[PDB]
Amino acid sequence: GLFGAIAGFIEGGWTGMVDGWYGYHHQNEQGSGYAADLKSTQNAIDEITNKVNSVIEKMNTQFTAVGKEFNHLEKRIENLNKKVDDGFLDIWTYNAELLVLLENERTLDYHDSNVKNLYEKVRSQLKNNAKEIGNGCFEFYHKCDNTCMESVKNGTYDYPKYSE
Amino acid sequence: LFGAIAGFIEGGWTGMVDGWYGYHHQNEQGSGYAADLKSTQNAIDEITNKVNSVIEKMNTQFTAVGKEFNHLEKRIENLNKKVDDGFLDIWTYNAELLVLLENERTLDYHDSNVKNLYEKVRSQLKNNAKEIGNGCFEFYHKCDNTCMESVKNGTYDYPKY
Amino acid sequence: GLFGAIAGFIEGGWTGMVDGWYGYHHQNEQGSGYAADLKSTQNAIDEITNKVNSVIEKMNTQFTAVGKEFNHLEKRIENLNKKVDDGFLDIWTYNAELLVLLENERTLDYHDSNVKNLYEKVRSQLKNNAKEIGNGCFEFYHKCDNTCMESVKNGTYDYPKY
Amino acid sequence: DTLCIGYHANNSTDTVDTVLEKNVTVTHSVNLLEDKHNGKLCKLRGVAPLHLGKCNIAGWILGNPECESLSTASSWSYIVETPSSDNGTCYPGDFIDYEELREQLSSVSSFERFEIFPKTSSWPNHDSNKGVTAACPHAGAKSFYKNLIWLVKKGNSYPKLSKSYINDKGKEVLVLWGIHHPSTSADQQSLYQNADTYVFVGSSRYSKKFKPEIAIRPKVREQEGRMNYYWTLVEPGDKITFEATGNLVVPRYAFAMERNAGSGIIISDTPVHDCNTTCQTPKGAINTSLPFQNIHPITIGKCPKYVKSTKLRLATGLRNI
Amino acid sequence: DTLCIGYHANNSTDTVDTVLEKNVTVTHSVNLLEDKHNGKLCKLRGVAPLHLGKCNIAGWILGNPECESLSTASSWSYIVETPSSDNGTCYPGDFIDYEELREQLSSVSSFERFEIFPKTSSWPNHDSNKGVTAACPHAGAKSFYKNLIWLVKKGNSYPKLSKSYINDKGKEVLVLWGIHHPSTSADQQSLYQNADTYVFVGSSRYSKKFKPEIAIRPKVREQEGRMNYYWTLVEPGDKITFEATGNLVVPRYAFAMERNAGSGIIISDTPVHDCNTTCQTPKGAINTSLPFQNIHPITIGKCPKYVKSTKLRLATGLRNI
Amino acid sequence: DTLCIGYHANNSTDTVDTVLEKNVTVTHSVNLLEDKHNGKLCKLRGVAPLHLGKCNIAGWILGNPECESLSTASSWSYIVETPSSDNGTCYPGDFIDYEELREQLSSVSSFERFEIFPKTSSWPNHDSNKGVTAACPHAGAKSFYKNLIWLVKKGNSYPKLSKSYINDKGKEVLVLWGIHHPSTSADQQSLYQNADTYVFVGSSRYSKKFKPEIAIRPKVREQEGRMNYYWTLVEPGDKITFEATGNLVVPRYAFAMERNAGSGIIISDTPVHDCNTTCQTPKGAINTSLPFQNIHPITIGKCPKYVKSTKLRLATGLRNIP
Ligand SMILES: *[C@@H]1O[C@H](CO)[C@@H](O[C@@H]2O[C@H](CO)[C@@H](O)[C@H](O)[C@H]2NC(C)=O)[C@H](O)[C@H]1NC(C)=O
Ligand SMILES: *[C@@H]1O[C@H](CO)[C@@H](O)[C@H](O)[C@H]1NC(C)=O
Ligand SMILES: *[C@@H]1O[C@H](CO)[C@@H](O)[C@H](O)[C@H]1NC(C)=O
DSSP, X not given: OOSSTBTTTBOOOBTTOOSOSEEEEEEBTTBOOEEEOHHHXXXXXXXXXXXXXXXXXXXXXXXXXXXXXXXXXXXXXXXXXXXXXXXHHXXXXXXXXXXXXXXXXXXXXXXXXXXXXXXXXXXXXXXXXXXXXXXXXXXXXXXXXXXXXXXXXXXXXXXXXXXX | OOSTBTTTBOOOBTXXXXXXXXXXXXXXXXXXXXXXXXXXXXXHHHHHHHHHHHHHTOOOOOEEOOOOOOTTOHHHHHHHHHHHHHHHHHHHHHHHHHHHHXXXXXXXXXXXXXXXXXXXXXXXXXXXEEEOSSSEEEESSOOOHHHHHHHHSSOOOSOOO | OOSSTBTTTBOOOBTTOOSOSEEEEEEBTTBOOEEEOHHHHHHHHHHHHHHHHHHHHTOOOOOEEOOOOOOTTOHHHHHHHHHHHHXXXXXXXXXXXXXXXXXXXXXXXXXXXXXXHHHHXXXXXXXXXXXXXXXSOEEESSOOOHHHHHHHHSSOOOOOOO | OEEEXXXXXXXXXXXEOOSSOSSEEBSOEEXXXXXXXOSSEEESSSSOOEEOXXXXXXXXXXXXXXXXXXXXXXXXXXXXXXXXXXXXXXXXXXXXXXXXXXXXXXXXXXXXXXXXXXXXXXXXXXXXXXXXXXXXXXXXXXXXXXXXXXXXXXXSOOOOEEEEEEOOSSSEEEEEEEEEEOSSHHHHHHHTSOSSOOEEEEOSXXXXXXXXXXXXXXXXXXXXXXXXXXXXXXXXXXXEEEEESSOEEEESEEEEXXXXXXXXXXXXXXXXXXXXXXXXXXXXXXXXXXXXXXXXXXXXXXXXXXXXXXXXXXXXXXXXX | OEEEEEEBOOSOOOEEOOSSOSSEEBSOEEEOEEOOOOSSEEESSSSOOEEOTTBXXXXXHHTOTTOOOSTTOSOBSOEEOOXXXXXXXXXXXXXXXXXXXXXXXXXXXXEEEEESSOHHHHOSSSBSSSOOEEEEEETTEEEOOSSEEEOBOSSSOOOOEEEEEXXXXXXXXXXXXXXXXXXXXXXXXXXXXXXXXXXEEEOSSOEEEEOOOOOOOOOBTTBSSEEEEEEEEEOTTOEEEEEESSOEEEESEEEEEEEOOSOOEEOOOOOEEEEEOSEEETTEEOOOOOSEEOSOSOOEESOOEEOXXXXXXXXXXXXXX | OEEEEEEBOOSOOOEEOOSSOXXXXXXXXXXXXXXXXXXXXXXXXXXXXEEOTTBOHXXXXXXXXXXXXXXXXXXXXOEEOOTTOOBSOOSOOOBTTHHHHHHHHSSEEEEEEEESSOHHHHOSSSBSSSOOEEEEEETTEEEOOSSEEEOBOXXXXXXXXXXXXXXXXXSEEEEEEEEEEOSSHHHHHHHTSOSSOOEEEEOSSOEEEEOOOOOOOOOBTTBSSEEEEEEEEEOTTOEEEEEESSOEEEESEEEEEEEOOSOOEEOOOOOEEEEEOSEEETTEEOOOOOSEEOSOSOOEESOOEEOOOSOXXXXXSOBOOO
């Protein structure tokens, strides 16, 4: 979207991956399968959770009793009171509505970013040892086994293995 | 924020008037500017929904601000004045900052769309062309009109160099 | 972060660089040392300063005297007055608290962006003449002297050899 | 052979502001701030406002001789009153709960004026023709309020009067009356003939016994005497009773009325017109969908929030180069 | 051999809104808006509300014969009053500063009702047994307020009475009394026997001299007379003095009281229950930590801000595909 | 040969909060929240406040004997009143529209006190020397308000008095007066000698006829009687008329006055000083450009918005690390 990753060059999501928000789908000789990223998904959850908690926790209100009583000869201050109620009604309705619109845009861009960054951390790690498909998928040139995929997920990837 | 607009692509094209983002081909069959169909449409649709959100979400109550008080009601008159000035400061500040914030985001939104447009063609012409650095790509095989199409349409999928 | 640069592929910062926010650390035959980017740091300072000034300057208030007096037979309008005070108290407390949370997130992403962009401006300038380490550091293949580093910082980098 | 990538640009000079940078030129932009009005006082819903012209509220309901050319409107969304309108209570006095009455009259759904106590048949024992004053001139000649009658003694006789009205209308009835305070005990007897008098008004909710306060006040409009004005709303089915031994300015006309709360009163020279609006200000109406306006703090209707800003320009396009 | 990178997805249909795009499906989302209440009137702190049932505040403190409800709560967090409760001032009259009294009674920390002027020993020179009316029926028979006594003449004699109470309680004492206005001068003497009477109530702060206003009011509950009700708070150590030559409805019961400001009064048919809540609305309580609610504008306690929104769904996951 | 890229760091321990993460250390940061005041009551514009000291507003304008020591200020931006000031209406009574009077006196542009009805020439038919009370002591001796005169009968005679003042000043004139209510009908005649009396005050706008309410009130300051206080503003060119057959506490001094609305009244022990401020609170002044403050909800002037926050630290630099 804003980072090009989600709904961008990576068209869709995987109903197959249920371990986390972002992950991988390997395809070697030992088999296939989906595997979500440990570290990446954890940070997102921790940070998104803190986000929801911030929008909530920062709202601590005063003990007040809205609502007042006025007799037939106090219509003015009754309408004053009504104005102060309607005023707060408009300020909070508008702010809340826009707060959700704004933060929903940012949250979606936040996930888009995390995917882009995940893609980039792997790409700048397999310069020659693999090629860009364009679908967010990389095609190896040397053979890559299970212990090989590990060095990519763990970020501990040896690159002195340039083959063809 | 994304490096594209006013970044590595220094300026804009007064020549392109079809949309917000587009291309400028230069082959044997000629030149000319051509805006991106899909990309510009989404921007317009999304920017429009943005303006409509800032507006539509403001539905107010039918109220008659303004009250009358006699010389022996100066207090509640000043109370009333306080409730008016209070709302005056809350809305003035929020509106002013809302525009500053959303203007920063809108400009970054267009910057993003250009960057992404640049990236969608770059990851499509790895060896078949080279990066100039001015947001412009130089082909190595000859590229005709039907060739440029496969780039704009994203169907550059049967690469023949 | 949000752009991957700060606290991302460039793990830490340099206590050695004290000229600006973003810069370089060369390592050639003529020696080493840190040198902050002139143009990049200036814009950040100018723009971050305008940001702080915007959050402040846009708050010009009315001359008003909060606080009213009411006798024992005006407890209602006193509580009305209390409501209008507590109301403004909650609106401003919440907005200010969130304004700082939101803008702090954006400011950190703004610095992250500036670094990423600085890294990209150098990378798209030394395609073959150097290689990506992955630590935000580039390793040259031809020898690069002091006048050479200049053409990178200044963005005026020729490409006439291997 | 090359393929470049870039963005739009044009002759636009529209500038906007951002948190980071000021006066940034942009390809396209809209305005969130409304700063334009039609300079007219329009209809607030489907109903037009009640314009009092040269008179204010007081002079209107009491029936000031100068406020003849004005009101039989069945309803109004709000009330307009020119800053140059001074014709109100022509006979110096105090209008009790005046501001409150205005607020309750600011908007009505139905409003018919009927003769509550016909002048010919209601007061056989008192004189209902001498009650005029120089303070209320109608063509140089001495006159008085049209909706009130100033009862005086009928030839050296002022019997305890006791009239009452029962609200057979299907709505509240606004009843106005007056209590006259002579300047001298000489005028008191010359007017009522009893030196110590009282007046009592009562309904199912209202009750008060007035005692004339005889003394010399500073001259206002040639009057050293004073005349206080009182009003009340009589519930449907309820009845209001008048009783007096003098000093009572009785009601001649009342008002069947149905009020819809939530309106105000505009004081402005701005012309009234046959136009529709959802938001009204003293300077003119506002036909806008924008969230904010800097035209006027005082507003009536479903209006945009009043902001102190001079410009709220929201960028929609991108940087221009 | 390949290694791909992607993101989560599922059967979720949760939609949210963004500034840029509407109705976007996401994997996970929470709701910021509270729109659910328990449909009960609960306790506001640790203390339960005072439910008046078929009576309103007036009928409760005056001691209306029907208002024998929740005999003696020591305290309450707020007061509940059904829209169908009409039993208040059964004898037609005006309750002075009534709304103000309600606000000050809305919440109380301690509240004991004691006999300030015992009926047997306090009024030896007046009759304290004939003071009843058809307007205040208790079982078809003529009765009166329990907390007030309608003193009348003791066989053709009404001596100047002069009682006084000194506040020996450790708190404010709410004292209520009444001033009776007969319809006819005949009823005046038949009741007190002195034609021109006065009543004076006074403390260290309160002082006022009442004069009976004798006249015929429209009939309310068979009464052409009226009875106004007055109240005052007597400081600890201070004393209140009553003095009258007639027309005084004396206090029989008072109230030792300690008020804690900052509460209100709910008018609702909603059942009262034995439950805890931090926020109360007329429709029911709100047990939530969310910042916003669209249940009711009128609220009591530490409550979420009332918003007009129908849904405030905050995205937490990412796009769903 | 290498060329690396990185960012700044230092000894900074400044922590800030973000929507995503708490307690984040940063290189540089500013504070948006003002939490510091000078602990003084300063001048609000160019004008200093009116400090009443041991007296409150009532005792000040009425002329309580104890409030002799600091008034004749031509103007003030606001009024300061110590929580320990009890010297007001020394003679037990009710000050009508008192709170309203305070609000209209809170700030004044010009304020001169003149003798509206000179004591020697204005009341030839009444005694203007016996009007004193133990409730208003000046040095153990019986005294009374300085700006009011308690007229009593001149030897078994109280003729209908009828004085009037016409506002020749170029501004509103605050006129205060009193109505005395004796405790017993015996005191009534002993004081005025007419058993049934009345008092009437009237201008072009004001009008009211007072009737003395004779009865025994509980004792306050030795007084079983009461004395109510009334005030009105007389327009320039207009005249106010007094008429009474007794029980009237006539005005001796009035006040030529020009009020500028939009101020308040501070009740505080905080010392008054010769300093400038744009914002004032009961605890002290606030000299800040910041948008928010948590010093005090009650404020006077162009002040920052009161916030409940304990800290509003806005990050300006970046994350701090080795
Ligand atoms: C209607 O209003 C006019 C204008 O205020 C009144 O005439 C004025 O009366 C004042 C008071 O005596 C004079 O000083 C002005 O010179 C008058 N103006 C004019 C233009 O004559 C008039 O009295 C009002 N009519 C009624 C019936 O009260
Ligand atoms: C999108 O969803 C909202 C959420 O309730 C719904 O109200 C609306 O109908 C939808 N949009 C349109 C145009 O119908
Ligand atoms: C109590 O309320 C009922 C219902 O309105 C009414 O009819 C009745 O007269 C009242 N009784 C008393 C004693 O107030």
